Amino acid sequence: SLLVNPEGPTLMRLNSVQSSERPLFLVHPIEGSTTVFHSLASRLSIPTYGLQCTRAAPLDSIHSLAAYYIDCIRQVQPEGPYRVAGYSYGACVAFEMCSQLQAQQSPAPTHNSLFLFDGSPTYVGCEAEAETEAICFFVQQFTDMEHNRVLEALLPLKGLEERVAAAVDLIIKSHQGLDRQELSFAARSFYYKLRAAEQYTPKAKYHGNVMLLRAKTGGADYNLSQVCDGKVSVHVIEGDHRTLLEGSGLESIISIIHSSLA
């Protein structure tokens, strides 16, 4: 899976457009990288930035992460409204960022544009078990090892740091050239990211318009109507969860969002 530079800037420039036009801000999927947005960003005639998940990111909750990302983007664009989007895990974060923006200017309606790429605030035994499960899933991507084997290696360890260290060692054994500090940060942050997303529930009903770009190859609105009482527009995009932001699906996405990004 993708890795991020733990010391990388939170707010990354994704294309070379330099103007005063309101930028599009794109929130990372769970891997925390913004490289998945390269194609989309290259198509746009507005400055496009990504929020990547680095050592800077507060992972205690989706609320904290979203608050931090809002604070970052408001440095590039001091005045709203904001064009914010999120992909997969990032959809939950992007939704929370807009939820916080709504609360800050309440009862004045927001005119923030929110695009959810195949994700939603809903579509994202004990703590030692939770760490183990999360770290096991993380290892299973990078390695070919059977679930039970990774489980018996991680489950009895002392705590999160020991699980992370053993996970990095397991991954390195299979892929010697991978960077140990990037893997250590990715593994530890993966647990915190899952824990935050699983505890997340929006604090209030979202009144703003939401656009969901759902992958054609798999509720129809990813439960958006349950947390949104504004206009929810759902578009079915060619491709799967990982390919809708490329090729034909990205062409469709560009045509659908063009008028909003004017």
Swiss-Prot record:
Where on the chain is Phosphoserine found, per UniProt?
S16
Question: Which parts of the sequence carry N6-acetyllysine?
Answer: K158
Summarize what the UniProt record says about post-translational modification.
Answer: In adipocytes, S-nitrosylation of Fatty acid synthase occurs under physiological conditions and gradually increases during adipogenesis.
Region annotated Thioesterase, chain positions: 1-262
Instruction: Please describe the organ and tissue distribution of this protein's expression.
Output: Ubiquitous. Prominent expression in brain, lung, liver and mammary gland.
User: Cross-link position, Glycyl lysine isopeptide (Lys-Gly) (interchain with G-Cter in SUMO2)?
Assistant: K216
Q: Where are the transmembrane segments?
A: none
Compartments it resides in: Cytoplasm; Melanosome
Catalytic residues, chain numbering: S88, H241
Its function?
Fatty acid synthetase is a multifunctional enzyme that catalyzes the de novo biosynthesis of long-chain saturated fatty acids starting from acetyl-CoA and malonyl-CoA in the presence of NADPH. This multifunctional protein contains 7 catalytic activities and a site for the binding of the prosthetic group 4'-phosphopantetheine of the acyl carrier protein ([ACP]) domain. (Microbial infection) Fatty acid synthetase activity is required for SARS coronavirus-2/SARS-CoV-2 replication.
The misc remark on file is: The relatively low beta-ketoacyl synthase activity may be attributable to the low 4'-phosphopantetheine content of the protein.
Report quaternary structure and partners. Homodimer which is arranged in a head to tail fashion. Interacts with CEACAM1; this interaction is insulin and phosphorylation-dependent; reduces fatty-acid synthase activity.
What's the protein here called? Fatty acid synthase
Instruction: Say which species the protein is native to.
Output: Homo sapiens (Human)
